[PDB]
Design an enzyme around this catalytic site. Structure first.
Site, mmCIF file in Angstrom:
data_model
loop_
_atom_site.group_PDB
_atom_site.id
_atom_site.type_symbol
_atom_site.label_atom_id
_atom_site.label_comp_id
_atom_site.label_asym_id
_atom_site.label_seq_id
_atom_site.Cartn_x
_atom_site.Cartn_y
_atom_site.Cartn_z
ATOM 1 N N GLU A 72 2.185 13.019 -14.165
ATOM 2 C CA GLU A 72 1.322 12.841 -13.532
ATOM 3 C C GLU A 72 1.520 13.574 -12.654
ATOM 4 O O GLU A 72 2.650 13.537 -11.786
ATOM 5 C CB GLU A 72 0.631 11.534 -12.661
ATOM 6 C CG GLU A 72 0.056 11.690 -10.836
ATOM 7 C CD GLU A 72 -0.060 10.208 -10.600
ATOM 8 O OE1 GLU A 72 0.549 8.996 -11.102
ATOM 9 O OE2 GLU A 72 -0.894 10.242 -9.894
ATOM 10 N N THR A 74 0.853 -0.653 0.318
ATOM 11 C CA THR A 74 0.106 0.153 0.021
ATOM 12 C C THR A 74 1.101 1.248 -0.200
ATOM 13 O O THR A 74 1.965 0.974 0.302
ATOM 14 C CB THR A 74 -1.157 -0.198 1.586
ATOM 15 O OG1 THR A 74 -0.590 0.042 2.310
ATOM 16 C CG2 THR A 74 -1.886 -1.188 1.640
ATOM 17 N N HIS A 85 -3.640 6.769 0.808
ATOM 18 C CA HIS A 85 -4.364 7.154 1.739
ATOM 19 C C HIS A 85 -3.859 5.410 2.473
ATOM 20 O O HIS A 85 -4.093 4.649 2.879
ATOM 21 C CB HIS A 85 -5.836 6.538 1.239
ATOM 22 C CG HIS A 85 -6.287 7.528 0.185
ATOM 23 N ND1 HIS A 85 -6.736 8.413 0.254
ATOM 24 C CD2 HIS A 85 -6.775 7.478 -1.357
ATOM 25 C CE1 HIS A 85 -7.508 8.974 -0.727
ATOM 26 N NE2 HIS A 85 -6.781 8.274 -1.809
ATOM 27 N N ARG A 113 -4.142 12.093 -4.890
ATOM 28 C CA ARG A 113 -5.131 11.066 -5.310
ATOM 29 C C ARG A 113 -4.917 10.196 -6.785
ATOM 30 O O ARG A 113 -4.394 11.238 -7.183
ATOM 31 C CB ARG A 113 -6.825 11.278 -4.921
ATOM 32 C CG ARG A 113 -7.169 11.580 -3.663
ATOM 33 C CD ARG A 113 -8.849 11.894 -4.262
ATOM 34 N NE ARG A 113 -9.855 10.276 -3.868
ATOM 35 C CZ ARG A 113 -10.955 10.360 -4.767
ATOM 36 N NH1 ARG A 113 -11.124 11.410 -4.984
ATOM 37 N NH2 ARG A 113 -11.016 9.684 -4.461
ATOM 38 N N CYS A 114 -4.860 9.327 -6.589
ATOM 39 C CA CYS A 114 -5.017 8.657 -8.016
ATOM 40 C C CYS A 114 -5.886 8.867 -9.310
ATOM 41 O O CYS A 114 -5.807 9.014 -10.392
ATOM 42 C CB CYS A 114 -5.305 7.113 -8.434
ATOM 43 S SG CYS A 114 -6.816 6.352 -7.568
ATOM 44 N N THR A 115 -7.210 9.752 -8.530
ATOM 45 C CA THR A 115 -8.350 9.984 -9.465
ATOM 46 C C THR A 115 -8.330 11.920 -9.064
ATOM 47 O O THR A 115 -9.510 12.260 -9.796
ATOM 48 C CB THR A 115 -9.272 9.627 -9.182
ATOM 49 O OG1 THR A 115 -9.313 9.436 -7.427
ATOM 50 C CG2 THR A 115 -9.329 7.844 -9.715
ATOM 51 N N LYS A 167 2.479 -5.301 3.865
ATOM 52 C CA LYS A 167 3.495 -4.150 3.550
ATOM 53 C C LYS A 167 2.828 -2.359 3.038
ATOM 54 O O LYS A 167 3.352 -2.042 2.501
ATOM 55 C CB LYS A 167 4.733 -4.413 3.112
ATOM 56 C CG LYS A 167 5.942 -3.805 3.709
ATOM 57 C CD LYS A 167 6.583 -3.504 2.082
ATOM 58 C CE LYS A 167 6.941 -2.432 1.067
ATOM 59 N NZ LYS A 167 6.125 -1.699 1.111
ATOM 60 N N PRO A 168 2.619 -1.771 4.472
ATOM 61 C CA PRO A 168 2.695 0.017 3.895
ATOM 62 C C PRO A 168 3.677 0.450 3.114
ATOM 63 O O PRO A 168 4.893 -0.098 4.303
ATOM 64 C CB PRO A 168 2.408 0.388 5.424
ATOM 65 C CG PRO A 168 2.595 -0.519 6.758
ATOM 66 C CD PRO A 168 2.813 -1.633 6.326
ATOM 67 N N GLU A 198 -2.613 -1.460 -9.290
ATOM 68 C CA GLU A 198 -3.491 -0.401 -9.298
ATOM 69 C C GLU A 198 -2.169 0.976 -9.297
ATOM 70 O O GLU A 198 -1.409 1.188 -8.278
ATOM 71 C CB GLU A 198 -4.286 0.478 -8.190
ATOM 72 C CG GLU A 198 -5.411 0.022 -8.789
ATOM 73 C CD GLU A 198 -6.126 0.914 -9.764
ATOM 74 O OE1 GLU A 198 -5.554 1.967 -9.914
ATOM 75 O OE2 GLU A 198 -6.119 -0.084 -10.903
#
Lengths: 473, 473
Positions: B374, B144, B148, B279-281, B170-171, B243
């Site tokens: 991005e 992750t 978030h 955010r990815c979005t 695993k963050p 993602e």
């Protein structure tokens, strides 16, 4: 003598790949030794073309193809048998399966599995609806094996057509002619030619391009574990649907009556020996509980002896050859070896080149290569297992494979125990592992596949992207 | 100061990873520099443990977790803010999202999406039924991002619980403390500890084990493109749900009244700056058709100027920092450069360390790095596009990404043209790209993801194997 079919054009090359008939090792055809550039061109054409076929037009093409297969079945199965060596009985049957694939794909065209979500669901809700819809990919790469020169191509190509995708097929160089013929049928049935190419050549020349071409959104592959694992390593960041082998059991439980044992024997022999045993889901292990083995084995033996093995072009032949002599030699070797480890060969009238008889072996140690490894021939190997379901299940689950299975029993409690406990993609009660409809979810776990389902319906999903959209409501 | 959580046990190490508060760059926490052996142990535990929770029990745990998130939201959002630097407003909102994730995953537990097929369908038909069911995997690996720290773990962990999987998380080492806290909440909520571990460490030490561990059936990852592509290359023969970023547009069509432009401006500013634009979005490109740009831009400017940016722990702060000062510097850079290439900076009260104001830039060349790359910060960049939908759509589609999108228009015809034409996973009419429910299908194409859907429902499917069984009928 067949050129590649690249978006409807015949494309040739100087070097040839010879295709030999496994019955007598003679050359029955030749196809191009295609190169990366040919695949590359096929994919560029595929990527640039945006299919606009209505669902109606798709269905017409797929249903027209189905009739052409029926109409031309004798011709098509001749081609299959001449490159694969399976009997005309098996190859005629294959044309029937391909007929089902196209028919069901055609009929699934009227289907829209879109969903709708309401959005006023939580404290974060809104007066809004989300809607779903599917879209085709840029291009699809299909790589097919020798075992179903027709049906394997059909399973990859029909769902692609049904979804407005553009597919490039590379059949194995062992059995490429059936694919080339299927392409011709499809163009005649009215497929826009850009939607299908079939390219041929040596894996060292054209194989890698199928895996790495930048236009390829998805690789769909059916074949061996080693090639499969290779592909998985080399097709970075592409979706992959990998269908590798099986090592599938037919399990015979000790509740069965003698009548039932006889039916189970029918399944065992048919499942072990169909398509010359060349199925990912062939019966490769007959797990017979000790209690009933002495009654069961003679029934199997008797049925195996009735099978007629020989000239595949002879319509009374049941069992033709396997793909080639060195596969046959390897399978017989595994038999001899099991015997040395204590197995009891009951029927073995002798191997002849690629022609293997339906060899019956009893008391096969279940560690032995014959049954621990996947043995892709018409061997009928009986493994005697304990009269204990937990032990039986553990044994059934002890291979690297997990695709399908068959269980013969009338005891529901035991049925559901096996259904729940076998580590496989499919458990068939009172049918061979190989039994399915062409549109039910099909796929294995462990070394049998990378975990995605196939069959007409799941392939159609697999071959699309879901797009959502939301509207104020 | 926090140890790893390995199946409920606190596991520490000598070397530490310091976690810094991006607002003032001070150390607010420390977690272990975990190593391959720690992950390896977590996975061995996961693989060996077979969850037997009923659907009822799973739902209770999930719903109890939801209430603990609501009950402790102030504490949890403090932890988020302190390691990420987003405002308390944003971090409180994040807890609400995780609240939804657990709630919906809990409620989806009563659901069985099994299907039934009849088999008497073709000439090869049989009096038989095929049934479907789902089973969990051996182990799931979840990786992750900092974005978030809570909700990303929630999305990977809740569906795993719901499906009787065992997951190891695993963050990112940048924001690992939220994950550790969520693990504690889950154990308290009644989760069998074997079902969840959270390990921490440098990517160079523990990262690869997360990708290659032999027990791992599925890797689910959300993060950058480069790290994603790396994972795709290294996780051979494992299912992967990847993602990656987005570069998502908010498209303003020229049919809009001034009233509607104002609403669209609200969406542009919120979508661009929420979660500090991380955010990815996030709205990363505001594509305004020329005709309306002169009326639209001032409305954007006016709203951007109302945002309060500063101390993230101040509850009246709208916009906190980005993840760190060098990200902030990189984003401001891209703005300067766009200005050199002709862009018009309308509001830029100055960067301070990791604190970026909501910079408003108009006339951004759409080739410029600011919008072609991005840019993961609260930049509000307006790209003026032609009063032509085909050109607009082509421009929108011209990046390497394809995740989500928003379109503001009242003309249905044009709406549906954009819905069909944008190459993305989601098209939101009159909402920011980021809008979804926590259980609708979520995922991009192109560089935004490897093509599998997420969200609670698709995650739950993804985290299981479908097994079919057939019965004589």
């Amino acid at each position: 003598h067949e050129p590649m079919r690249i978006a409807g054009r015949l494309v040739d090359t100087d070097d040839r790949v010879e295709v030999r008939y496994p019955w007598n090792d003679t050359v029955v055809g030749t196809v191009p030794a295609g190169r990366a550039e040919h695949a590359r061109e096929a994919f560029a054409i595929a990527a640039a073309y945006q299919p606009k076929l209505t669902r109606y037009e798709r269905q017409k093409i797929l249903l027209a193809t189905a009739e052409a297969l029926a109409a031309r079945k004798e011709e098509i199965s001749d081609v299959i048998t001449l490159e694969l060596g399976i009997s005309k009985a098996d190859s005629l049957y294959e044309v029937g399966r391909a007929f089902d694939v196209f028919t069901l794909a055609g009929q699934m065209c009227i289907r829209d599995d879109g969903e709708i979500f309401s959005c006023d669901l939580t404290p974060h809700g809104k007066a809004r609806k989300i809607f779903t819809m599917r879209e085709p990919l840029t291009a699809i790469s299909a790589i097919t094996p020798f075992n179903h020169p027709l049906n394997m191509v059909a399973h990859k190509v029909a769902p692609a057509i049904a979804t407005n995708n553009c597919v490039v097929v590379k059949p194995t160089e062992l059995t490429p002619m059936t694919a080339l013929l299927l392409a011709d049928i499809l163009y005649e049935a009215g497929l826009p030619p850009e939607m299908l190419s079939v390219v041929t050549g040596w894996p060292a020349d054209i194989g890698m391009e199928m895996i790495t071409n930048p236009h390829v959104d998805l690789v769909t592959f059916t074949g061996s574990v080693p090639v499969g694992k290779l592909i998985a390593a080399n097709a970075h960041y592409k979706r992959q649907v990998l269908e590798l082998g099986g090592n599938d059991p037919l399990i015979i439980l000790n509740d069965l009556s003698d009548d039932d044992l006889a039916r189970a024997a029918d399944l065992a022999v048919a499942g072990a020996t169909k398509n010359s045993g060349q199925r990912c889901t062939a019966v490769k292990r007959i797990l017979c509980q000790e209690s009933v083995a002495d009654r069961f084995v003679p029934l199997v033996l008797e049925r195996a002896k009735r099978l007629r093995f020989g000239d595949p072009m002879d319509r009374s032949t049941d069992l033709g050859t396997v793909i080639h002599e060195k596969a046959a030699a390897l399978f017989e070797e595994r038999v001899m070896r099991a015997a040395e480890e204590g197995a009891d060969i009951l029927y073995h009238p002798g191997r002849s080149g690629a022609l293997l008889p339906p060899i019956v072996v009893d008391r096969v140690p279940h560690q032995s290569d014959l049954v621990l490894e996947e043995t892709f021939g018409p061997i009928i190997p009986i493994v005697r297992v304990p009269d204990d379901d937990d032990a039986t299940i553990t044994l059934s689950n002890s291979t690297a494979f997990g695709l399908s299975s068959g269980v013969c029993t009338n005891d529901y409690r035991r049925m559901q125990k096996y259904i729940a406990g076998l580590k496989v993609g499919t458990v068939n009660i009172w049918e061979v592992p190989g039994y399915r409809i062409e549109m039910s979810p099909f796929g294995g776990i462990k070394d049998s596949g990378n975990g995605y389902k196939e069959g007409v319906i799941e392939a159609m999903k697999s071959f699309t992207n879901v797009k959502t959209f939301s509207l104020p409501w």
